[PDB]
């Protein structure tokens, strides 16, 4: 499923992401845009045998278990398949753990590179939330 911008903004708001760990809703919408282009089925293979899964590109070495990644820690205690669902819930609940790790949203490279320090509110503007 490829979300629309405002569709995803409303979903993320319902999931309690607005101001989660201090990050306003726009940060999360922007992160999803640059991480996955709003695509819930996005995947990216990495050189360590891990894969990044889903709308927020959560990694299989540290966060979810895909059964094929060396050194798997599975800190979110979830199968990576659950992160490819059309509903965002499993991704969001894992993202809540990730953003709580100690370095905020810096865990998401695409967010650091294209969202951090920008006018992130633009991503929810017009959405009638």
């Amino acid at each position, epitope marked *: 499923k490829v979300f629309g911008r405002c569709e995803l903004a409303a979903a993320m708001k319902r999931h309690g992401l607005d101001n989660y760990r201090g990050y306003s809703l726009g940060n999360w919408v922007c992160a999803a845009k640059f991480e996955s282009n709003f695509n819930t089925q996005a995947t990216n293979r*990495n050189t*360590d045998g891990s894969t990044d899964y889903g709308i927020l590109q959560i*990694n299989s*070495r*540290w966060w979810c278990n895909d059964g094929r990644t060396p*050194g798997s*820690r599975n*800190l979110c205690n979830i199968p990576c398949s659950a992160l490819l669902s059309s509903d965002i819930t499993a991704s969001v609940n894992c993202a809540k753990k990730i953003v709580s*790790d*100690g*370095n*905020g949203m*810096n*865990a*998401w*490279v695409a967010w*650091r590179n294209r969202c951090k320090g920008t006018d992130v509110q633009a991503w929810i503007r017009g959405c009638r939330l």
Partner: nanobody, 126 residues
Framework: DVQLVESGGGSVQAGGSLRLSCAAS????????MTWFRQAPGKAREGVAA????????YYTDSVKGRFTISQDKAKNMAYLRMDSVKSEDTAIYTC????????????????????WGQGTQVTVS
């Protein structure tokens, strides 16, 4: 790929100070942590001090807390280890490590979390 190069090191008197430097080059944009490890004679490598480059947050092994300070110059892709108040037990080969993955803090002092390594530099406390 990322190249790491250490400078500094050598002899120091107990109670004294030494500064180590680590310069990163190559695919430096994706660097997440720069971290100092060490390996004392006859012992396994251990993480000493980790720095998360996008916030400046730092993580230390218990045996060095308060004595060693890791810092960076992010714009120049540098990490520094200031070793103050050195002890006998600090004699070791010190190695810079880096990674381009967003490693959870709890695993930031584990060597298996790191992808790139310097050459090692000897520090000897007399």
């Amino acid at each position: 790929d990322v190249q790491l190069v250490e400078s500094g090191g050598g002899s120091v008197q107990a109670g004294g100070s030494l500064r180590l430097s680590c310069a990163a080059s190559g695919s430096t944009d994706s660097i997440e942590y720069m971290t100092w490890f060490r390996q004392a004679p006859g012992k396994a490598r251990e993480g000493v001090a980790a720095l998360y480059t996008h916030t400046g947050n730092t993580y230390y092994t218990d045996s060095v807390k308060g004595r060693f300070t890791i810092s960076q110059d992010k714009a120049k892709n540098m990490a520094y280890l200031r070793m103050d108040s050195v002890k006998s037990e600090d004699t070791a080969i010190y190695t810079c490590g880096a990674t381009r993955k967003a490693v959870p803090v709890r695993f930031a002092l584990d060597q298996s979390s790191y992808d790139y390594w310097g050459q090692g530099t000897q520090v000897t406390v007399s």
